C-alpha cells in the first residue's frame, strides 16, 4: 500500500 | 520472526532530452508482490503474487493512481537535482528511493525507512527516530531545510508507524501460506581436484527462503577465511534462493574442514564434512 | 557519479539433467548505473526469447536483475551469459558450468 502524499526534493 | 514491506523506486533520465524510465517494485520480505515499469509500457500497478491478485478493483485503482503520482514526483526530482548540481540535460542521471516498515514476531512496529540516492551515492535519509534527516552533501542540505520547514518527517512517521504496519499485517494474513513459510536449505558438499596438491571443497545451500543465510568454513573447529570464496546469495527463479562457499585445501587434509549453515528454517545449525 | 561493475553468476534453477526441462539463469548484481545488456548464449549464439526480473536494488543502492529462459540441457550443448555495461570496455562472457 503506497504512501498517499507526494514530497519533492 | 521479523517481516518487512519495502518499495524500491528507480528513475533514469536518458541520454539527451526524452522521457525518463520509472520502475516501482514492492516486496514483503524477499517476495515481490507488485510492479509498474515504464519500459514495459505499464498503465496499471500489476500483481506478482496470488495473495495480492485477490484484492478488488478499489485496491488496484488506488495503487495505480498512487504509483502514477510517485512517477510524476521523480519526474520533478530529476529536474530539481540537475538544478541543485548544475548539470546539463544531455547526461543520463539516476534517482532511487526506498521506503517501508519492519515488524517483529508480535507484528509490532520495529523500524521505518524513507531514503534517496542520486547517481549511486546517498542523497538524503530519514533517521531511525523518524523526526530528522541525514543529508549526504551541500545540495541535500537544501532538501533537508525545505522538509524541516514543511514538517515532512511528521507525515512520513504517521504512514511508517500506522498505514505501512496495518497493510503489511493484512498481506501477511492474506499470504500466510507463502509469506509465513520458511524453506530450510538443501545442503550438500562437492570435491574438485585442482591439482595432485590441492582440492576445492564447495558447500551448497539450495531452495531456501527467506534469502538470509550464513555459510562459514572451519578447520579443526576453528574459523577459516584464508583460501575461501563465497558467492552472493542468488534467486533460483521460483521464489527460493541458492548460495555456495568454497575452500581450497591441501590433498589429504579434507577431513579437517567443516561447513556450518545457519538459516531460520533449520531446527538447528548444520555441520557438513566431506565423506569419502 | 559512482559506477560499479556487475557481478555475474550463470546457473540453472534446478540441478541439471540431460533431457529434463529446466531454467538457465544469469544473475547480475552490484552494478551502477542501471542500464545493462544481458544476452543468454547457446553454442555462442544469442537466445532470442529471454525473460527478466523487475529492476530492484540492495541497501548499498546497487542494482540486481535475473535473466532467464526455459531450456532442456544435453551433454553436447553449451550455454553462457554475455554482459555489457558502461564499466566494461567489451562484453564479458561467463560460461555455464553444471557444478557452479
Residue numbers in the entry:
A (entry chain C): 1 to 9
B (entry chain A): 1 to 276
C (entry chain B): 0 to 99
Kindly provide excerpts from the paper associated with this entry:
We studied the prevalent cytotoxic CD8 T cell response mounted against severe acute respiratory syndrome coronavirus 2 (SARS-CoV-2) Spike glycoprotein269-277 epitope (sequence YLQPRTFLL) via the most frequent human leukocyte antigen (HLA) class I worldwide, HLA A∗02. HLA A∗02 is an MHC class I molecule that presents processed intracellular protein antigens at the cell surface in the form of short peptides 8–10 amino acids in length for inspection by CD8 T cells. The dominant Spike epitope was narrowed down to residues 269–277 (YLQPRTFLL), and T cells that responded to this peptide represented >1 in 10,000 total CD8 T cells in many HLA A∗02+ CP with the majority of the nine donors using a TCR made with the TRAV12-1 gene, suggesting a potential shared or “public” response (Ferretti et al., 2020). The Spike P272L mutation that has arisen in at least 112 different SARS-CoV-2 lineages to date, including in lineages classified as “variants of concern,” was not recognized by the large CD8 T cell response seen across cohorts of HLA A∗02+ convalescent patients and individuals vaccinated against SARS-CoV-2, despite these responses comprising of over 175 different individual T cell receptors.
To understand why this single amino acid substitution had such a drastic effect on recognition by many TCRs, we solved and compared the structures of YLQPRTFLL and YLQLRTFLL bound to HLA A∗02:01 at 1.67 Å and 2.0 Å, respectively. Comparison of the atomic structures of HLA A∗02:01-YLQPRTFLL and HLA A∗02:01-YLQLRTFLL showed a largely preserved fold, but with local geometry alterations at the epitope residues 3 to 5 (Spike residues 271–273) which presumably form the majority of contacts with TCRs. The HLA A∗02:01-YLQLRTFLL structure shows fewer internal contacts that maintain the shape and dimensions of the bulged part of the epitope, which may result in the collapse of the peptide bulge upon approach of the YLQ TCR. A comparison of the Wuhan and P272L variant peptides may also suggest why the YLQ36 T cell does not recognize the P272L variant. Structural analysis of HLA A∗02:01-YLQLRTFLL indicates there is a lack of intra-peptide bonds present in the P272L peptide compared to HLA A∗02:01-YLQPRTFLL Figure 7A. The lack of support in the P272L variant peptide resulting from a lack of intra-peptide bonds may cause the peptide to collapse under YLQ36 TCR approach, displacing the peptide and abolishing peptide:TCR interactions. Bulk sorting of tetramer+ populations was used to generate a T cell line from nine of the CP. These lines all responded to YLQPRTFLL peptide (13–53% total cells) but completely failed to respond to YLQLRTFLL peptide despite this sequence showing slightly improved binding to HLA A∗02:01 compared to the parental (Wuhan) sequence. The ability of the YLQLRTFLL peptide to bind to HLA A∗02:01 was also confirmed during tetramer production.
